[PDB]
Amino acid sequence: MRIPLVGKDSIESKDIGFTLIHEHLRVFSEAVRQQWPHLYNEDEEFRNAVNEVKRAMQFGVKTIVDPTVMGLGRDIRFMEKVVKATGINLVAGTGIYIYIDLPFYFLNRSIDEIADLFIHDIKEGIQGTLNKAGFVKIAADEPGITKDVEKVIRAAAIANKETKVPIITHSNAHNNTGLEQQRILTEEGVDPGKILIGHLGDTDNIDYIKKIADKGSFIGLDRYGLDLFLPVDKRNETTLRLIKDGYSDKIMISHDYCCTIDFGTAKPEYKPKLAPRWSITLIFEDTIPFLKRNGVNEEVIATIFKENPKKFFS
Amino acid sequence: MRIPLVGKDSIESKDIGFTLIHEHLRVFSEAVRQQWPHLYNEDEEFRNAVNEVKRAMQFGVKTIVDPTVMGLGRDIRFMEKVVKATGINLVAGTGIYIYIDLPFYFLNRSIDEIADLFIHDIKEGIQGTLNKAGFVKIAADEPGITKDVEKVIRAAAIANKETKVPIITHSNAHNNTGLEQQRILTEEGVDPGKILIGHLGDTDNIDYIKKIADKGSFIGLDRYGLDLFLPVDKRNETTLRLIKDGYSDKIMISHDYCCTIDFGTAKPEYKPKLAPRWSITLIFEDTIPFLKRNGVNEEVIATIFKENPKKFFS
Ligand SMILES: [Co+2]
Ligand SMILES: [Co+2]
Ligand SMILES: [Fe+2]
Ligand SMILES: [Fe+2]
């Protein structure tokens, strides 16, 4: 009775256990799928998601937090099917994922109207179901904090203040967007500790990463396997350094793995080059063993994968 | 055997009869409706579309061309239901309606891949049905001809050359986007006579409008009732002037009426000042009577509403 789960009763934060804080069962462009369904194969998508989740659970993963929201093809019914097939604790969210402008629907609509949509999903349920959103997801990338991106950020603050659900962000590690997201949210009264600033693992700029952590938010070292952003070994060195410097209190680790994704970039021919080892279990195969080889004890691993997600949702 | 119709056998273009070349039974943002279905009322959308179409048919309209495509919430099954309830000849299209960037799906995808989507809808059918697209719709607006906007334009040209279907455009009457669309399309081998450059009625800049007609394309005096773009009176003066100057064989007239539309701008509160007399029959109430009482004979009216559409689809 605190964090809502897809297809299950809500749980107290103490029960979320070992968590992958940022993974995607399936990503797609809503308009493209609606207009050209011939491009997609739901049987295969389902098989891929179930296979990945099952493998994560074999390594001891108990909860997966999936920040697929509007703009990334959130489908609560698909998520339900995956839960039924696996027994995973799955946390779904609400929010809006844009880089530049909002859909035309939002022309001449207020920040409050936007926040009302998030609050609907949190208090009433997602897409006509009784599965409730447990967090709000927002984004900014290369384009920076555009007017509409800012509106969404402020709407998320409103939803958090009314419901107390935490906020997960997508940012671009190289252009200050994460720092700006944290600034706007905290200025609007969001507890910095209820924010995860995403994709900071995409850079080895430790000063930037620490600056965000020092302002009180979790830092998302959350794209392990996506070498095109930063290779696994560079990520490992950055993660280790932050741990040695005492930042385990703010570190969160994940893969941002998409079991299926429709971006032209994610075509299989590009995988060997851009993300050869990208999967939902890479951190068990490489990262965690690497950290242990370098003196990181199990208490720090537990802090990152258990205590931190617990605090985030408490 | 020439123009495909939703829910009917195809017709020869000679049988198209009195036509409204640009109207929308329903417009919505795919992503918003997918994520927040509570915002929408299907019963109300259906009743409104049926009511409008019936009233148009009472005024003698035989065929409505509906350029709702990806980005505007095209729904071929909704369209089928409206046809069943009214008996209207309805021409559905394919294409992509964007102002800035394409959906993330299109990252690292070619112009050919986009064209293939349009060719699919034209040759195979729309959204898993055998209802086929009879034209391609593209857009550009305030942001101008962005990189992605241009990709879509070039994809439409490929689709036209392969299938011979005409092209309808959305443009902004004040920033040369219409002229640019025409230029790129014609450079890529599209017959200027198979292009309708849209929303030119939004300006009283007669020289700009004529330039597009002179280069061989139909001109869309197609937003009658939308005073926020240009009041009915100013539209009528422009239309009349063009006819007197000998442009009736390039003129097409419509309302761009949306029987339902989800833009925040379309809230009923704004209707009195933004579009007080806007409907799918405004031209029968105001425009055609205005033209006829100003020296425009029955042959010219037939050219605009019967001959030009026939030629466009021939
Ligand atoms: Co992200
Ligand atoms: Co338009
Ligand atoms: Fe993600
Ligand atoms: Fe339109």
Numbering used by the authors:
A (entry chain A), B (entry chain D): 1 to 314
Paper quotes:
PLLs are natural lactonases endowed with promiscuous phosphotriesterase activity. The catalytic center contained two metal cations coordinated by four histidines, an aspartic acid and a carboxylated lysine residue. A structural analysis of SsoPox, a hyperthermostable counterpart of the PLL family from Sulfolobus solfataricus, has revealed that loop 7 is shorter in SsoPox than in PTEs; linking the active site to the loop 8, which forms a hydrophobic channel that accommodates AHLs aliphatic chain. Indeed, W263 is located at the start of loop 8, involved in the dimer interface of the enzyme and positions the lactone cycle of the substrate onto the bi-metallic catalytic center.
